[PDB]
Write an enzyme that holds these catalytic residues in place. Structure first.
Site, PDB file in Angstrom:
ATOM      1  N   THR I   1       0.809  -1.203   0.000  1.00 26.37           N
ATOM      2  CA  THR I   1       0.000   0.000   0.000  1.00 26.37           C
ATOM      3  C   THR I   1       0.842   1.252   0.000  1.00 26.37           C
ATOM      4  O   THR I   1       1.861   1.324   0.677  1.00 26.37           O
ATOM      5  CB  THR I   1      -0.935   0.021   1.225  1.00 26.37           C
ATOM      6  N   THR I   2       0.395   2.246  -0.748  1.00 26.35           N
ATOM      7  CA  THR I   2       1.004   3.556  -0.708  1.00 26.35           C
ATOM      8  C   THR I   2      -0.070   4.636  -0.729  1.00 26.35           C
ATOM      9  O   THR I   2      -0.902   4.681  -1.637  1.00 26.35           O
ATOM     10  CB  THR I   2       1.975   3.770  -1.877  1.00 26.35           C
TER      11      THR I   2
END
Lengths: 221, 201, 221, 201, 221, 201, 221, 221, 201
Positions: I1-2
């Protein structure tokens, strides 16, 4: 229980009337001890007199007599006994009898303030010896507490107190105190009646509560 | 710890040692393990001091209230039964104790009560870390036909032996004798010391 | 339940009136035992008499008879039975019957003090043998307890007691005690009526409670 | 930590060290372990600071209320009994403490109370990591016939010895003396320092 | 407790009538301290006067006197004591007496708003020294709080206040304050009566509450 | 983390670093650890950010309500006592924090409060991973007779030293000074930067 | 509390009558601020006037005055203070005063709908500055809320409002607003009476609530 | 709340009388939308009119107007708002307004069946757009729900409905619907009175609820 | 995730990646992490999908109700404070999330909120496994004086870099821009793809 326009609580006053119909008992302090006498009324012959006691013990050094509704009195005595044991477990010993009496009185007081219940129709006399000395207390339906040198409860209360106010002397020998107590009860009798051997118990400093035997009572009667 | 209780024809003799261990050393040389809980009933404690002291206070209150309510001293078996129930109810969060309950009703009785509420009557019993040494002595020397004085001497010898092998045992010996005639009587240290000298201990 | 201006509790007094309409039963102590007799009133022929018992057992050594509202009586008897078992589990045995009676009476007392409920319209007689000896107690709607040498409850209470006060003798043989009990019940009957074979139970020291058979009852009738 | 309490003919002498350890270093050089909780009663604490401080506040409140209600100071044994109950009730989620309770009623008493609620009376006792060193000194030098001044000097020597071997011990010594005549009296540091110099410590 | 068409609460007003029948007590501020005096009425000789106290302590620096129903007063005093201890445990000390009084008053207020209970028939005077200074408060059945330089409660309230409004001076010496207080009580007596040695207690800044001995009281009587 | 609080004749000086670590890296260079919670009272936090922020909000509410109800600012010792109780009550499910509470009543006070509710008053104290370095500096350079300006400079030096050895420490230094005259005053970064240059840091 | 045939709630209307007997207070908005003035009635000289405040603060930017039953008012003020703190803890700050007032009003409303309790005999005025601006609200026993430019409560409510409806001008200087407020109170006085120095408090945008000193009040009196 | 001999619930009927005394408001469906208009009665000039809203929003697509006891109405609106949010959290969106109305009505119904409480003196109109279309509901004190093409509540209910029954046309342009609504309100006025700029809000399919400005209202007045 | 959020003079720019991992593989190429929760407020989620989705629903409901009741949009700091409380209350049975809350009141703000309820305001922040790569890019290229278009391009570059090193990151980039003028605006994929080509990514 609600207030009248006079600031009176009728249910409490009515409870007091119930008390006035009970048996007569008195208590008095004497030299290094406290005396309790109960005017046990003898009725019939089919009653097991040997099992009828008016003076209850709360613990080895504390006793009480009651007058009023019998069933209610039994309940309050049980309460006092349990309460006394709780104190001993908590602190290791009972130090001041006054506090035991208060715990009982508070149990009674709340029944005059909360709805859904009626007040106890019971007057009690507490006597015993503690850290301070020989002590003697009354407790009425309202939950009011007073310490006395000498007192009385029941139908003969007024007659007995009137007598004691005149005749009572401080620091009497136990035997003299008992003799006086018997005279006091006799003065409260209806004309033509007699006093039956009363129940007598006393305690002196350093000792446990002592209940008189049948023969011992008759010697003063 | 060492506690001893024996029965005789018409008497119960109980005795304990006074040493108390805290924080892994002999913090106290004069504790108390032998209690009177009723007119004719005594109790000895062993195990955790905290738990034991609490139980003693409860038992005193419970038996006193019983007497007042029923106008009679509680039967020894009933005393044991109370403890059985009190302890078993918390068996998963238990009191860390071993108790002896002894006294007289119509006969002398001694009960051994474990932490699970297990209660068994016997002629003699002992609790504490030094109990194996006491059993050795009693097993060999105990006699049902013994007098109360012979009984007291045996109890002293049994504890004295435990004091020589159990590092957790020590201190002055407390002895109490229960009879119907006299009730619970705690012996003076003067008498116990006298007996100790006579016995060559 | 509240107090009147006289210090009286009318709901309790009314409950007492309910009791007065119940069947008559008596109890009496005799040499090393206690006797209970119930004046079972026979009505119709379609009732399974074999299943109708007036003397209940609470345990092997304790029995009771009741008079008043039947449904209420059943409830109090069940309570007493359960209470008795709790004591045995707790201590291993029952020592003093008086305490069982008190537990029952206290159950009754609270119904005279708390609102939302009515008092039990039931009078009970408890009998049995314990650590002390053969014992006999009454318990009324108020929750008042008295130990008797001989007593009675129900509509015939006054007649039976009056009789017993005159004729009752102590330390009678069981057979004499039963004979006396039968006479006492007969004295309470309405003119022109007769006594039907009553239910009789007795207990002697060292034994369990014994209920008389039908033939045994007739022999004294 | 080092706390010391001893009894004398008609007095109780209690003393402690002031060092407090937090986060594995000497965060505080001047804490407080010796408290007055009643007119004639003092308490010393040891173990976790948080728990101990809470107990002190409770005890102060409890004893003050007792006095007001019963018009009398609570007996020392009763004070000990309260703590026994308070601590035992939470024995499975316990206070991490060791307490000494001392004071005067008709006689001087010193009680040692563990975290399990175990309470034992003694002539002298000490708590904390430095207690083994204190016992060494007291065991050799303590005398029942000592005067109050001799008592104070002994207590200083006992703690001073602990300060030399127990890395958790240190700081100025607090000394309090309880008598019926004067009540709980906290000694000035001026007097304590004077005694320390005289004793060659 | 409900509202009348006038916006009045009769049960509260009736409770006030109960208060008017109680004993008389007063309080007054003086130079760096506060004084409490209670007109203890002496009756009989069989009462243990030594055990009868009208001035209660809540803590070492706070005292109170009450007038009205005795049983109710006892309950409120106990409440105040417990409440005071809770504050000390929570903060380490008591800072402002006013808040203690409020906690008590709030306990009283709710009994005038919720059904099922009756209001307390009690009026209290609180006195003590705190972070701010010497303080003196009243609290009535309604739960209303007022701080005074000088006040009074009980049957003699009106007479005592009237007197004080005229004679009261600020920053008096303790001895002068006591002297004044005694005069104030005497002015409230029924014709032909006399003032018995009253109970007197005072506190000055930096000190604990001080109760006068019997001889000390007589010197001002 | 590094927090520092010292007392002077009539002042309290508190300072902290701004760095906040999350997910094992320097996520935030400019957090906040030094709070005003009352007119003359400040608090520094250390440990878990979540827990600490919650406590600050509670304390602000609690002290504000106190003031309004009693018409007076809460005593610093009382402020510390609240926290002691709040934290101890949940000691088995504790707040992961270390707090400093400082302010002025009639005198300047600084309290160090641990997660167990342990509260000890001192002349100076520091919390956080860099506290050992601060103690080194204060132990050597702190003087009771210091002026408020000398005090501020010392606090800057102490934190600056911690920033050089504690990898968890860093950011701009926040300094607040509490006096009766001015109350809680937060110093401008302009003044702090000026002092930093003058001190050769 | 039940409905009449007219759809009216009498207990609520009666509570309103209680309010009418309370002291008079007013509030008015002015240029960038809000003003509260309370007509403190001075009685006796034995009352510690320094400790008598009519304007309460709920928080640094919110104040209130009450009229009606004093004990009830105290309770509602405490409630408002606690409620305000809960909001700050939850969101970090108080944004809209209206919501605080509603939480209080809702506490009041339920006492008009549920049995077992009586409605609060209290009318309140809330004033302060929030995210929107200077605000001024009333809240009556029913639990009804209205925002005003200028208002009043208490026995003088009708007289004060009538005056304000005629004389009130918007965006006045603080000094002019106070001057006007004083005139308004004077117009409500009984013939022959005078206005004693009232309690005055005001707040302006960006500032905290400011209470006037004694000398400052006299300058406008 | 109990039944009369006619099968009627008087407390409910009385609650209806309370409603009849409230302000007048109406609602009507139009082409792809729903309109709400409230006859805000203007009184005094010291009331902050800018803060007085009669049309509440429950959510972006649902609005309501109430008439009756104001305090009760506020409570029901809060309930509806909370209830609406619960539905969104549970399902992700609101699908059928009818169910929201029912949840509110059920809250009201129980107060007519259980003792200890009085019914809400409130009538509500709910309007909004959902999965089905533009909808318009009433809810009375009893808890009865009806969907309307056009309706009204309050003292002018009868006059407004009578008018609408005659003049109302389906699928009108928003502007025509508003024009009609204004005429309807005017027809309900007492002789000699006038209609003050009413509060107007409307919603069309695909949009959020739109509240008219002051100038927009005047253009139709 | 970013997830990435930055502030500019008068704007907040937030962006995320769409990849969602379940059962240890790329089960979904097009999830949703960037939400509008108010008119001028957005939120990005990271961590466990279940927990995060629940929190978003609660926040939407809570903020909508707030608006209706108080007739005003909730302050961004207040939004952050709610979450702090909601999360801290269950810290022992926590939500497994990392949140970013950004929006405009009188100024743009971005808050980073951890699972313990810790909330810290910053100029820019990122969450998720790819956050270290984003910080690298922002640390080097971020400038406070940037325009909104320069801002959007930076955010795309930062995420694009993360997508090249973080195996848990991937998918189309979602970008939203919040201004007072326009409010929360979600950018078309047409514009984002155009920018991506121009940037040579």
């Amino acid at each position: 229980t609600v207030f009248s326009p006079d600031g009176r609580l009728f249910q409490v006053e009515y409870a007091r009337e119930a008390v006035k119909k009970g048996s007569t008992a008195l208590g008095m302090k004497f030299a290094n001890g406290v005396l309790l006498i109960s005017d046990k009324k003898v009725r019939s012959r089919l009653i097991e007199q040997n099992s009828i006691e008016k003076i209850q013990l709360i613990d080895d050094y504390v006793a009480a007599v009651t007058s009023g509704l019998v069933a209610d009195a039994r309940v309050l005595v049980d309460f006092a006994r349990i309460s006394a044991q709780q104190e001993k477990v908590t602190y290791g010993s009972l130090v001041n009898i006054e506090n035991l009496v208060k715990r009982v009185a508070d149990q009674m007081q709340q029944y005059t303030q909360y709805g859904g219940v009626r007040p106890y129709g019971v007057s009690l006399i507490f006597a015993g010896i503690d850290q301070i000395g020989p002590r003697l207390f009354d407790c009425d339906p309202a939950g009011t507490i007073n310490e006395y040198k000498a007192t009385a409860i029941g139908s003969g209360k007024d007659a007995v107190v009137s007598f004691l106010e005149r005749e009572y002397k401080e620091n009497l020998p136990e035997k003299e105190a008992v003799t006086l107590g018997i005279k006091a009860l006799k003065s409260s009798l209806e004309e033509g009646e007699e006093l039956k051997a009363p129940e007598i118990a006393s305690i002196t400093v350093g000792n446990k509560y002592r209940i008189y035997d049948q023969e011992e009572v008759k010697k003063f009667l | 710890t060492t506690t001893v209780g024996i029965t005789l024809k018409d008497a119960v003799i109980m005795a304990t040692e006074r040493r108390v261990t805290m924080e892994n050393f002999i913090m106290h040389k004069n504790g108390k393990k032998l209690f009177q809980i009723d007119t004719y009933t005594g109790m000895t404690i062993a195990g955790l001091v905290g738990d034991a002291q609490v139980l003693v206070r409860y038992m005193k209150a419970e038996l006193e209230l019983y007497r007042l309510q029923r106008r009679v001293n509680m039967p020894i078996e009933a005393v044991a039964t109370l403890l059985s129930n009190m302890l078993n109810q918390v068996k998963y969060m238990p009191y860390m104790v071993q108790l002896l309950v002894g006294g007289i009703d119509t006969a002398p009785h001694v009960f051994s009560i474990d932490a699970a509420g297990g209660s068994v009557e016997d002629i003699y019993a002992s609790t504490g870390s030094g109990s194996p040494f006491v059993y050795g002595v009693l097993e060999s020397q105990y006699s049902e036909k013994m007098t109360v004085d012979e009984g007291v001497d045996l109890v002293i010898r049994a504890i004295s032996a435990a004091k020589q092998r159990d590092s957790a045992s020590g201190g002055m010996i407390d002895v109490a004798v229960i009879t119907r005639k006299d009730g619970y009587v705690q012996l003076p240290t003067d008498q116990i010391e006298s007996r100790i000298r006579k016995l060559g201990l």
